[PDB]
Amino acid sequence: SLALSLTADQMVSALLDAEPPILYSEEASMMGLLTNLADRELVHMINWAKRVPGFVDLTSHDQVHLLECAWLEILMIGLVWRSMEHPGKLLFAPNLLLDRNQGKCVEGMVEIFDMLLATSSRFRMMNLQGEEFVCLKSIILLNSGVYTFLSSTLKSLEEKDHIHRVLDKITDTLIHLMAKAGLTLQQQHQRLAQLLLILSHIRHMSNKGMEHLYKNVVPSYDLLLEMLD
């Protein structure tokens, strides 16, 4: 796999080049816009995923399982990244900048906004860099579904092992970026841990988003398979 031969700088360059554009917005009127926005973002996400080194080496079925598991987390991490320089607010799009009080417009929707704002403030706290962000987003794509592959074929074992090797490459990339920026080794491993522990909170926000939502709108396995073909 070409992915495993990449240096840290080449991994970063690939991921930065794959970044989707920032899209614009075009009770049920709030969901209306958010749903229309997310629907358009999903098409770009599929095409971004195909450009994450290592992803297309997987079978189509495994590519869809990973996207099925990660898509809301990926949308949320993008939102939190967009929102860092707007404290107390969430920039869903350049023309859709929302404060806490506009969260309440939907029943259980403020709990999630508060958690999203706390994630943006954490990123701001830590001075998260764009090169670190793209690494974290690709970690979400590969990691979130890797522990729920249902098969036990030789192929499934080889797919899981490939995913973990690619994840190790991204870990190496994160450490290299920190080393280049002048962090000591102790600081390097401390910051890596801080960044990966935030992914647990992003999993949590995604899960709660789903729980509240369970308005047919969660992309199915078959939809993702069609979009990825």
Ligand X SMILES: COc1ccc(N(C2CCCCC2)S(=O)(=O)[C@@H]2C[C@@H]3O[C@H]2C(c2ccc(O)cc2)=C3c2ccc(O)cc2)cc1
Residues that bind ligand A1AHY (CB under 6 A): 34-35, 37-38, 41, 75-76, 78-79, 90, 92, 98, 102-103, 106, 108-109, 112-113, 116, 209, 212-213, 217
Taking CB under 6 A as the criterion, the residue among 87, 88, 108, 130 binding ligand X is 108
For residue 137, what are the contacts with CB-CB under 8 A and spacing of at least 6? 15, 74, 77, 78
Burial 62-99 (b: 16+ CB within 10 A, else e): bbbbbbbbbbbbbbbbbbbbbbbeeeebbbbbeebebe
State yes or no: residue 109 binds ligand X (CB under 6 A): yes
Do 33 and 26 meet the contact criterion of CB atoms below 8 Å apart? yes
Size of the site for a second copy (CB under 8 A): 36
């579904």: which residue's tokens? 145
Separation CA 64–CA 133 (nearest Å): 22
Binding site for ligand X (CB under 6 A): 31, 34-35, 37-38, 41, 72, 75-76, 78-79, 92, 106, 108-109, 112, 209-210, 212-213, 217-218
Contact residues: a second copy, CB under 8 A: 114-115, 118-119, 122, 139, 143-144, 147-148, 150, 164, 167-168, 171-172, 175, 185-186, 188-190, 192-194, 196-201, 203-204, 207-208, 211
